Amino acid sequence: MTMYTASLAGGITLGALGGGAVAIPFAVAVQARLNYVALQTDVLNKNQQ
Amino acid sequence: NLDDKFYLTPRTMYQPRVATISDFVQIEGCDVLFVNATVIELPG
Amino acid sequence: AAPNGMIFFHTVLLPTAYETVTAWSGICASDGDHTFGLVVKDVQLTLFRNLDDKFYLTPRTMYQPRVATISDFVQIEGCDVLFVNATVIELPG
Numbered sequence: 734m735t736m737y738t739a740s741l742a743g744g745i746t747l748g749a750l751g752g753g754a755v756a757i758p759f760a761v762a763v764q765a766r767l768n769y770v771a772l773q774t775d776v777l778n779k780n781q782q
Numbered sequence: 783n784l785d786d787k788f789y790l791t792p793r794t795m796y797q798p799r800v801a802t803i804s805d806f807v808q809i810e811g812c813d814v815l816f817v818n819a820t821v822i823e824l825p826g
Numbered sequence: 827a828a829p830n831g832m833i834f835f836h837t838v839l840l841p842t843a844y845e846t847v848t849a850w851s852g853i854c855a856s857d858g859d860h861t862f863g864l865v866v867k868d869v870q871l872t873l874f875r876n877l878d879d880k881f882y883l884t885p886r887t888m889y890q891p892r893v894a895t896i897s898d899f900v901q902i903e904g905c906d907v908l909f910v911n912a913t914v915i916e917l918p919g
């Protein structure tokens with residue numbers, strides 16, 4: 734169970750599946766989730782802080 | 783908006799965006815609660 | 827039907843290979859002195875470029891590339907750092 738949860742957590746930042754462990758920033762994943770919720774139209778004034 | 787330009791926003795989050803002609807469907811009739819406009823005022 | 831119930835046969839797609847593409851989160855278009863951005867209207871689609879520098883869109887469930895048109899994009903004022911730079915000529919028809 735702990736390995737399962739760790740793998741679930743680590744899969745969020747995995748950029749590709751066919752090769753090595755290439756990662757993306759967590760903020761990029763958060764921005765993708767935000768775009769899924771609603772299409773963001775203010776690119777300059779990002780306030781993820 | 784203030785400049786009489788039509789905008790579209792989702793209801794989950796306020797993310798206004800400019801409206802284009804491809805976002806609309808044309809129908810014959812009109813409703814009472816529709817905003818009146820001419821060809822010039824229509825979105826580009 | 828089954829004793830005191832039922833059985834379901836679910837048929838699913840099993841992938842055996844992956845296509846690698848270079849994807850962009852948007853296009854920063856510079857028409858003269860007017861710089862604006864174009865983002866994909868459907869968040870379920872991935873935008874990439876072919877060998878002939880033509881923009882294509884594909885779903886992430888299955889690799890089904892299709893040519894991108896202007897009606898698939900939303901115009902915004904600002905640009906992001908991770909956007910591909912382009913001019914009016916390079917924009918989709």
Ligand SMILES: *[C@@H]1O[C@H](CO)[C@@H](O[C@@H]2O[C@H](CO)[C@@H](O)[C@H](O)[C@H]2NC(C)=O)[C@H](O)[C@H]1NC(C)=O
Nearest residue numbers: 810811812813814815816817818819820821823
């Ligand atoms: C938009 O234009 C329509 C059509 O002219 C207007 O509807 C008229 O409203 C008046 C006032 O209530 C009625 O007496 C007429 O019978 C209506 N005409 C039709 C054809 O339905 C409407 O009021 C206008 N909306 C505005 C100006 O906000």
Ligand SMILES: *[C@@H]1O[C@H](CO)[C@@H](O[C@@H]2O[C@H](CO)[C@@H](O)[C@H](O)[C@H]2NC(C)=O)[C@H](O)[C@H]1NC(C)=O
Nearest residue numbers: 750751752840841842843844845846847888889
């Ligand atoms: C999906 O399978 C097809 C069919 O086997 C693969 O296409 C082959 O690709 C190799 C390598 O370039 C060529 O030598 C063969 O001629 C192709 N076969 C056919 C029938 O076109 C394809 O590469 C696979 N997709 C992958 C591995 O991503």
Ligand SMILES: *[C@@H]1O[C@H](CO)[C@@H](O[C@@H]2O[C@H](CO)[C@@H](O)[C@H](O)[C@H]2NC(C)=O)[C@H](O)[C@H]1NC(C)=O
Nearest residue numbers: 853854855856861905906907908909910911912
């Ligand atoms: C796309 O064009 C923009 C705007 O000119 C480039 O952003 C500049 O990048 C340089 C190098 O990192 C910075 O010093 C500038 O400050 C940036 N300018 C602005 C206005 O942000 C961007 O690098 C270009 N992308 C390419 C060529 O791939």
